[model samples]
Target: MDSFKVVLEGPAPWGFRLQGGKDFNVPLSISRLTPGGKAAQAGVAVGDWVLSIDGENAGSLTHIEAQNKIRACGERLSLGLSRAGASAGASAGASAHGNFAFEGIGDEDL
Candidate 1:
């Protein structure tokens, strides 16, 4: 997948977190995303790979370095992302951890 971008307005902890860094000897990926948060609203999903931070190549940074870069962005955080390359055809979540899929709310109250 081609890289996509997400710009978040916040004061740190922008409702998302990272996983898999140079420290872990793996490509960087998004680990957790808070529901209803700016990142989530922008379509950032767990397991998404990091391409860049603002303009720097984030995938090359150490976990700590990436964290520092993000913190230094001050209020506005810009991110470059792509769908998890390794997830290639995994059939686990096809059923949906988020069954909502922008449709069908909970049981009807009528």
Candidate 2:
């Protein structure tokens, strides 16, 4: 369950949408990235699991709590993410770039 962080500027301009759930280990997944949005422009693609939001532990939160944290970021956000078997070694920390490992989920899964 090791993860990395990405600091993002919000007032977001449609970067991404989140999905997932009931508990900490439930892990929020980035279900979609708005085409040409800030998140998309930033290289955050669909399927990366969200591990935190604005320094809050999304992993320890309920979906509602996690959603609110992202909303509460106002004009800035710091996100933590984990993608299984992706860039798991030295690159596992905060950065300006993104490294993803998407296996492809379905619409129903979203």
Candidate 3:
């Protein structure tokens, strides 16, 4: 017999919370590391907030910009996060503006 494993990714550049609690109104945060994916391999984790990609900030950029930025690589990504604060941890996200291939199981399926 043989077995196989599959992984899926979220549609949003950053994870989303259809229903949940957050800080500073930030609903969702990167909570998982997708093996051989963009954010994870790049060092993004389950608590990182995608503040900015490339030269555009997450809030100011359009949906398309976010997508493009998330896909871009070889640049520095400026992410603004509250971190864990005292209770959580450090808050910072940075990248060289490049996209990492995303692959993982989504919460819905789990």
Superposing every Cα of model 3 onto the true structure, what RMSD results?
A: 14.5
Per-residue lDDT of 73-97 in model 3, one digit per residue for the tens? 3434444344543322332242234
Ranking by lDDT: 1, 2, 3
Ranking by TM-score: 1, 2, 3
Give the worst 10-residue stretch by lDDT in candidate 3: 14-23
Clashes of each: 0, 0, 19
TM-score of 3: 0.36
- Report, for every candidate in turn, its global Cα lDDT versus the true structure: 0.64, 0.63, 0.39
Put down candidate 2 lDDT per residue, 59-94, tens digits, no spaces: 677766766777667667788777564622323342
Cα RMSD of all models vs. native, in order, equals 9.5, 8.5, 14.5
Q: Per-candidate TM vs. native? A: 0.66, 0.64, 0.36
Report the Cα lDDT for residue 58, model 1.
73
Clashing pairs in 1: none
Task: Tell me the spans in candidate 3 whose CA falls farther than 4 Å from its real position.
Answer: 1-28, 36-38, 74-110
Which ten-residue region of model 2 has the weakest summed lDDT?
Answer: 87-96
Higher-lDDT candidate of 1 and 3: 1
